[PDB]
Design a protein around this ligand. Structure first.
Ligand code: MG
Ligand code: MG
Ligand code: MG
Ligand code: MG
Ligand code: MG
Ligand code: MG
Ligand code: MG
Ligand code: MG
Ligand code: MG
Ligand code: MG
Ligand code: MG
Ligand code: MG
Ligand code: MG
Ligand code: MG
Ligand code: MG
Ligand code: MG
Ligand code: MG
Ligand code: MG
Ligand code: MG
Ligand code: MG
Ligand code: MG
Ligand code: MG
Ligand code: MG
Ligand code: MG
Ligand code: MG
Ligand code: MG
Ligand code: MG
Ligand code: MG
Ligand code: MG
Ligand code: MG
Ligand code: MG
Ligand code: MG
Ligand code: MG
Ligand code: MG
Ligand code: MG
Ligand code: MG
Ligand code: MG
Ligand code: MG
Ligand code: MG
Ligand code: MG
Ligand code: MG
Ligand code: MG
Ligand code: MG
Ligand code: MG
Ligand code: MG
Ligand code: MG
Ligand code: MG
Ligand code: MG
Ligand code: MG
Ligand code: MG
Ligand code: MG
Ligand code: MG
Ligand code: MG
Ligand code: MG
Ligand code: MG
Ligand code: MG
Ligand code: MG
Ligand code: MG
Ligand code: MG
Ligand code: MG
Ligand code: MG
Ligand code: MG
Ligand code: MG
Ligand code: MG
Ligand code: MG
Ligand code: MG
Ligand code: MG
Ligand code: MG
Ligand code: MG
Ligand code: MG
Ligand code: MG
Ligand code: MG
Ligand code: MG
Ligand code: MG
Ligand code: MG
Ligand code: MG
Ligand code: MG
Ligand code: MG
Ligand code: MG
Ligand code: MG
Ligand code: MG
Ligand code: MG
Ligand code: MG
Ligand code: MG
Ligand code: MG
Ligand code: MG
Ligand code: MG
Ligand code: MG
Ligand code: MG
Ligand code: MG
Ligand code: MG
Ligand code: MG
Ligand code: MG
Ligand code: MG
Ligand code: MG
Ligand code: MG
Ligand code: MG
Ligand code: MG
Ligand code: MG
Ligand code: MG
Ligand code: MG
Ligand code: MG
Ligand code: MG
Ligand code: MG
Ligand code: MG
Ligand code: MG
Ligand code: MG
Ligand code: MG
Ligand code: MG
Ligand code: MG
Ligand code: MG
Ligand code: MG
Ligand code: MG
Ligand code: MG
Ligand code: MG
Ligand code: MG
Ligand code: MG
Ligand code: MG
Ligand code: MG
Ligand code: MG
Ligand code: MG
Ligand code: MG
Ligand code: MG
Ligand code: MG
Ligand code: MG
Ligand code: MG
Ligand code: MG
Ligand code: MG
Ligand code: MG
Ligand code: MG
Ligand code: MG
Ligand code: MG
Ligand code: MG
Ligand code: MG
Ligand code: MG
Ligand code: MG
Ligand code: MG
Ligand code: MG
Ligand code: MG
Ligand code: MG
Lengths: 133, 122
RNA sequence: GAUGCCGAAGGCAGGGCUAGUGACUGGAGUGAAGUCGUAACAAGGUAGCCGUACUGGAAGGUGCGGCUGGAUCAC
RNA sequence: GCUGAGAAGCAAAAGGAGGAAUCCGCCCGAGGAGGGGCUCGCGUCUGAUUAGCUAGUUGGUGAGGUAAUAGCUUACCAAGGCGAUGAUCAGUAGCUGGUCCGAGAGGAUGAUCAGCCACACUGGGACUGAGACACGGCCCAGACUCCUACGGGAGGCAGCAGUGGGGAAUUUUCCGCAAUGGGCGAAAGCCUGACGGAGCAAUGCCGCGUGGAGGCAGAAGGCCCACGGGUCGUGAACUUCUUUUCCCGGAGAAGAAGCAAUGACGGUAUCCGGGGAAUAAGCAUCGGCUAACUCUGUGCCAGCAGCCGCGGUAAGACAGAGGAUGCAAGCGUUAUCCGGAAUGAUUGGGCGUAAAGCGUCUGUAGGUGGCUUUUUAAGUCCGCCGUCAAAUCCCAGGGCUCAACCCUGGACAGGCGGUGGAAACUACCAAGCUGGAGUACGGUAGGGGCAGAGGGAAUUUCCGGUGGAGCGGUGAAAUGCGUAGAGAUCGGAAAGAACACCAACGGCGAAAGCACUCUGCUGGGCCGACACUGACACUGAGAGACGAAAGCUAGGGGAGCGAAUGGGAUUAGAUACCCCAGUAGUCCUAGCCGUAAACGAUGGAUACUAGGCGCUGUGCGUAUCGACCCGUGCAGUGUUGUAGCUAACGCGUUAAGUAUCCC
RNA sequence: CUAUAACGGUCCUAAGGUAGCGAAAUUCCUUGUCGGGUAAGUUCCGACCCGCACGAAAGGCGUAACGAUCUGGGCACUGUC
């Protein structure tokens, strides 16, 4: 648990590859925000919170299998960019865009977390958390 | 691999190693022939190859190949040698430019004459 | 003018580093064809390999320990 | 103005032009701009087979010195300064605007052109001066060249040309101050091998040419041909048109700047006329990559080749011919650099078997590090300013007929510095929180380790009794042991070493390893409870400890086994396999060695991803109220196997899967 | 290819000289041959091995320190010359 962000991302990727809709993730401001964003983008069905023994679990419903489990044309990819060993930052004009914009990029900036779209409207650069296909 | 390790300078390039050290970074060098003789090629290529040992301006002694058909070269002759490798003979990394200094041009060669140092026939 | 201090070559001495060369000798590489053997690959005709010690013209042999990248048979 | 607390003390000049006006000067202050001197942050090659270096060295005072701060100098005081983030030492190198390459990230390099440094025959000094430790100045020493009437002198091309020499290789002992720039002068002007030009050279980049249009489909010739014909080929010859270039004549600039004058280039660039297709195409390649094919000549010869490789009688790979293809006033070969090369990998690789996981731990520096709230604003982000010289690259126009080249204007990057904001993430500051890591408590399994007791088979030898010919051994034998009584058998002693069954695809250990039994000293591990601390974590360069067997030093001990050694065979030989003997060693104490297929051929931590069948230790519920039994929670351990991974084999919750960190 | 002999045959013994060293306090022929030191070296140092006739407790081979030891060379110094 040296990195929480990468961990969330990873659990998602694993549950996804295994064709399961439901994931338990540990909550945190970052986690919660990231998931919110993930919802307003439409990458994930629904999110909700649970509590036991002062632990918080966000469970995430995931988009249903593609017209069977066997014949899948599409998966859902996640990639950590800035990680504890190398922190990647970008100014306004270097802000990444994924596959011509089909995917998104998550930024942590002065005004909070957002997508690259929001950064382009508001004109801010910052730290790039991950890429999402 | 580990960034921390890369910052100890764990990537270093392998320098370019020349194929003709005796030239010392030159297109050609002039030399005098110590000996002219023949050698047999590595099998299964059998023939008799024309080679001469040349002592150069850069001081080295090498063994260089003489192209074409026939030659007038003999000891205490001043020739000009150029690079390039003969896959046949072990140790022979150098040719002898034909048609300059003491090596005349190949007699009666009509085609690709520039390689062998031959005038154009009228 | 003379003289003191500092003073470059020049001198001597021992050092560190490198260049070349040297009777003889140790091994390495390539040489179709030479000599001696046949160690290795099949259970390679005593299973093979690693460490190590002793010995042998030479590949090697045996001892001690280890492993299967061991065949046969056990399933 | 300078010295100085002050009192005081001390310091300057130059005239020349003109008939006069006035001009160019002179001395002392005080500014300005430009040019220099210093000082500091950052960036500024390879080597650990270079690990300690430094004593005016690192600082303090007092005196000196410098244009100025300063160990710049000197005396005294103190003991620092630098260094595993690479000092010192060695090796290489002028650096930067830039140039070449690259999709980019960045690699290599520093010619011309522009800035800076450094040097001037080899070393060292100063002098003059605003400025030098001074290329065509001085002084000395040294090496070398010249002149000398031999007593003495002269000199410094890494200035322009030029000669020798070295070399694969790099140009005329040319013209001119007309332009621009310098120096001196009141000006006239003088000097400028800076510079402006010419000449030589395909060295390179760019433009143009070597003809345009038509040309019976008939002939000569080359070559191929199944002799039918194909192909050089509209190609030439041939007929017309044109004249860039060539040749012969004419005229002829801008460049020159405001009084005319003054042009090295040059009678050149350009413009007009007269002839006339007239003056002008080569070089590689043709096996595959790679575009382009056949024939004669040769026969593992002669030769080719960038790699693979061709060539022993019909060679698309040699040499010749014809034909074709590629480029074209160039075409090839060699050298150098980047590319392709993901082949040193940040973007962008790997480590079970292909090269590659230290033998295994403990841990120092170092790197990363859980959640919540606040703070700060170092990173990070946004705005504005300064600068990062001009030339080059990029964009937009303009000029030489075009292009190359030149000129104007402008800018993205990206760097550094100042300032105003933002506060999510890293970082900091203050307080919190348990799920990570620990402590206490209570349990429980264990060949964990060290130390001390005890036990039995078996074997060997020795002492007897019996007995009386072979034992032992091999594929078959023999050496060997035996009538001096062997082996066999019974009874006795003595000694050492190893621990049958249990034992199992079982247990513990960090690994190595650890098992007859017992007891003592002690290391961990796991499980259940909130009892508690509250991030104390994970890894680990150097460093430390442990580390099978063999081996060694010193002292013991010595049954069996057994390197070496000896004998017997086997065999062409047998320094081997087999047999008979048997020394080191194997054991114990105290050390050293530090290696193994030290293997899961798989570094460690964490998080997350179907199962099925098993086992060990425990806990819970159930079953009975104690052994099962069942279902389950953990911790480890084994076998099949889904997703996914992999070159395949296979791995697959004990990953070789999906991610993060360290080595 | 000349050479030499890792390899084989045979003879004889109780067995046939291993490690290391080697023209040596051991080498006869012999001032062996080669290298070095010297203008010139029968001595000296290093090496070859053809050890007349090395050799393992009559020890073999190394070796720092030491010697009124034996033996070669050099600087200083001198009537040794
Ligand atoms: Mg930046
Ligand atoms: Mg990488
Ligand atoms: Mg290359
Ligand atoms: Mg000196
Ligand atoms: Mg000396
Ligand atoms: Mg030899
Ligand atoms: Mg050899
Ligand atoms: Mg041969
Ligand atoms: Mg064999
Ligand atoms: Mg075998
Ligand atoms: Mg085998
Ligand atoms: Mg043996
Ligand atoms: Mg034996
Ligand atoms: Mg064994
Ligand atoms: Mg006065
Ligand atoms: Mg005066
Ligand atoms: Mg006058
Ligand atoms: Mg007057
Ligand atoms: Mg002034
Ligand atoms: Mg550089
Ligand atoms: Mg002092
Ligand atoms: Mg590239
Ligand atoms: Mg130059
Ligand atoms: Mg310059
Ligand atoms: Mg100077
Ligand atoms: Mg000179
Ligand atoms: Mg000087
Ligand atoms: Mg002065
Ligand atoms: Mg001067
Ligand atoms: Mg000077
Ligand atoms: Mg000069
Ligand atoms: Mg002099
Ligand atoms: Mg002089
Ligand atoms: Mg003079
Ligand atoms: Mg010159
Ligand atoms: Mg010359
Ligand atoms: Mg020359
Ligand atoms: Mg040239
Ligand atoms: Mg002028
Ligand atoms: Mg002027
Ligand atoms: Mg003036
Ligand atoms: Mg002139
Ligand atoms: Mg010029
Ligand atoms: Mg010409
Ligand atoms: Mg030209
Ligand atoms: Mg020309
Ligand atoms: Mg040329
Ligand atoms: Mg051209
Ligand atoms: Mg035509
Ligand atoms: Mg005309
Ligand atoms: Mg023209
Ligand atoms: Mg005028
Ligand atoms: Mg004309
Ligand atoms: Mg083709
Ligand atoms: Mg060819
Ligand atoms: Mg080439
Ligand atoms: Mg044939
Ligand atoms: Mg024939
Ligand atoms: Mg033929
Ligand atoms: Mg024919
Ligand atoms: Mg040909
Ligand atoms: Mg031809
Ligand atoms: Mg070329
Ligand atoms: Mg590369
Ligand atoms: Mg490589
Ligand atoms: Mg690889
Ligand atoms: Mg292998
Ligand atoms: Mg391997
Ligand atoms: Mg390991
Ligand atoms: Mg290993
Ligand atoms: Mg180790
Ligand atoms: Mg550790
Ligand atoms: Mg620490
Ligand atoms: Mg931290
Ligand atoms: Mg955090
Ligand atoms: Mg610029
Ligand atoms: Mg343009
Ligand atoms: Mg134009
Ligand atoms: Mg410009
Ligand atoms: Mg900027
Ligand atoms: Mg800034
Ligand atoms: Mg905050
Ligand atoms: Mg805290
Ligand atoms: Mg014990
Ligand atoms: Mg008993
Ligand atoms: Mg009897
Ligand atoms: Mg007998
Ligand atoms: Mg007896
Ligand atoms: Mg009796
Ligand atoms: Mg008996
Ligand atoms: Mg006993
Ligand atoms: Mg275990
Ligand atoms: Mg055991
Ligand atoms: Mg215990
Ligand atoms: Mg508390
Ligand atoms: Mg280590
Ligand atoms: Mg130890
Ligand atoms: Mg042992
Ligand atoms: Mg021994
Ligand atoms: Mg002993
Ligand atoms: Mg015994
Ligand atoms: Mg035995
Ligand atoms: Mg024997
Ligand atoms: Mg004996
Ligand atoms: Mg025998
Ligand atoms: Mg025995
Ligand atoms: Mg021991
Ligand atoms: Mg090893
Ligand atoms: Mg083992
Ligand atoms: Mg049961
Ligand atoms: Mg488990
Ligand atoms: Mg397995
Ligand atoms: Mg499996
Ligand atoms: Mg793998
Ligand atoms: Mg013979
Ligand atoms: Mg024999
Ligand atoms: Mg023999
Ligand atoms: Mg025999
Ligand atoms: Mg006998
Ligand atoms: Mg005997
Ligand atoms: Mg015998
Ligand atoms: Mg011997
Ligand atoms: Mg031996
Ligand atoms: Mg010897
Ligand atoms: Mg002698
Ligand atoms: Mg002796
Ligand atoms: Mg002797
Ligand atoms: Mg004698
Ligand atoms: Mg000599
Ligand atoms: Mg001699
Ligand atoms: Mg003497
Ligand atoms: Mg001697
Ligand atoms: Mg003897
Ligand atoms: Mg003796
Ligand atoms: Mg004796
Ligand atoms: Mg003695
Ligand atoms: Mg001694
Ligand atoms: Mg004494
Ligand atoms: Mg003295
Ligand atoms: Mg006297």
């Amino acid at each position: 648990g040296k990195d929480t962000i990468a961990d969330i991302i990873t659990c998602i990727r694993n549950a996804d590859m295994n064709r399961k809709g439901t994931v338990r993730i540990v909550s945190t401001n970052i986690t919660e925000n990231i998931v919110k964003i993930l919802l307003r983008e439409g990458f994930i069905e629904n999110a909700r919170k649970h509590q036991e023994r002062n632990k918080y679990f966000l469970v995430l419903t995931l988009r249903h299998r593609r017209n069977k489990k066997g014949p899948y044309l599409n998966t859902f990819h996640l990639k950590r960019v800035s990680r504890p060993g190398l922190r990647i930052y970008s100014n306004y004009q270097r802000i990444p865009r994924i596959l011509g914009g089909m995917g998104i990029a998550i930024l942590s900036t002065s005004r909070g977390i957002m997508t690259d779209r929001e950064a382009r409207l508001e004109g801010i650069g910052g730290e790039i958390l991950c890429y999402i296909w | 691999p580990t960034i921390k390790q890369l910052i100890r300078n764990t990537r270093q390039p392998i320098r370019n190693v020349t194929k003709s050290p005796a030239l010392r970074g030159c297109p050609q060098r002039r030399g005098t022939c110590t000996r002219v003789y023949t050698i047999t090629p590595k099998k299964p290529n059998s023939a008799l190859r024309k080679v001469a040992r040349v002592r150069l301006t850069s001081g080295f002694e090498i063994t260089a190949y003489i192209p074409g058909i026939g030659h007038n070269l003999q000891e205490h002759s001043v020739v000009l040698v150029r690079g390039g490798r003969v896959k046949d003979l072990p140790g022979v990394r150098y040719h002898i430019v034909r048609g300059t200094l003491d090596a005349v041009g190949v007699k009666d060669r009509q085609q690709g004459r520039s390689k062998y140092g031959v005038k154009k026939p009228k």
